Design a protein around this ligand. Structure first.
Ligand SMILES: O=C(O)c1ccnc(N2CC(O)(c3ccc(OCc4c(-c5c(Cl)cccc5Cl)noc4C4CC4)cc3Cl)C2)c1
Lengths: 226, 11
């Protein structure tokens, strides 16, 4: 209901496909060696790459550029982790052939990640598959995660919501025409928002586990995660 | 501090 939602819906979403991962990168998941070193390198190559397109996407969100600039940073540094997660779940659940699902998983398991963090991560990776989310549901959820006023180091959180709320209502509108036999779908998607938080907690520890054993990052990643 | 991020938002 209300295209004025669709003036931004479709608009949200040629932003979403506008860039995929370069296959100079994604075809290294196959062409290169399988060591905990190379495993970690590719993941870095891919997360860093994914930060770049993420920024591009975020900038094209209605009213984001209009925001305080001390918050535009805070929005990204807290949600980048979780946004990465969403876009790879998409990759694994739909089992997209450009993401190389079955192989990408194994690079991750031997990347020096504690099995303590490995496990709940694929508990999710599956968990989000059965929802069989549409791209609009993967896209809107990604924009909503970015536009999250509950992150840390935000001064004007009210303005952030003034831009999240439409896309929420657009999302809310969506789960009543695609799937109507169950009204409770819209707030099962919203539960994944909280699981990602639970993972954003675990991830900061994966980071230190890595930085501890000498695993290094890009200046971009080292900056978005300090 | 946090200036690599600002160059991607102004492109
Ligand atoms: O083929 C494509 O076009 C495509 C489409 C969508 N996503 C693509 N890649 C997978 C992607 O989501 C990704 C690429 C790299 C990546 O790095 C692993 C990682 C993670 C991580 C792990 Cl290990 C598991 C789940 C989620 C994350 Cl963020 N945390 O930190 C890091 C590191 C810098 C080294 C994590 C993810 Cl989720 C981006 C590729």
């Amino acid at each position: 209901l209300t295209p004025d939602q669709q003036t931004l819906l479709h608009f949200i979403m040629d932003s979403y496909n506008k860039q995929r991962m370069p296959q100079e990168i994604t075809n290294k998941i196959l062409k290169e060696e399988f060591s905990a070193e190379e495993n970690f390198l590719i993941l870095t190559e891919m997360a860093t790459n994914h930060v770049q397109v993420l920024v591009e996407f975020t900038k094209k969100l209605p009213g984001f550029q209009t925001l305080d600039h001390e918050d535009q940073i805070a929005l990204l540094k807290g949600s980048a982790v979780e946004a990465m997660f969403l876009r790879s779940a998409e990759i694994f659940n739909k089992k997209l052939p450009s993401g190389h699902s079955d192989l990408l998983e194994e690079r991750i398991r031997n990347s020096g990640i504690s099995d303590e963090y490995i496990t709940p991560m694929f508990s999710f990776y599956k968990s989000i598959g059965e929802l069989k989310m549409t791209q609009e549901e993967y896209a809107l959820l990604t924009a909503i995660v970015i536009l999250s006023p509950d992150r840390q180091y935000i001064k004007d959180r009210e303005a952030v919501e003034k831009l999240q709320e439409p896309l929420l209502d657009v999302l809310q509108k969506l789960c009543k025409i695609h799937q109507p036999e169950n009204p409770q779908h819209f707030a099962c998607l919203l539960g994944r928002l909280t699981e990602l938080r639970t993972f954003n907690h675990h991830h900061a520890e994966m980071l230190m586990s890595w930085r501890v054993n000498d695993h290094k990052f890009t200046p971009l990643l080292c900056e978005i995660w300090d | 501090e946090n200036a690599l991020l600002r160059y991607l938002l102004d492109k």
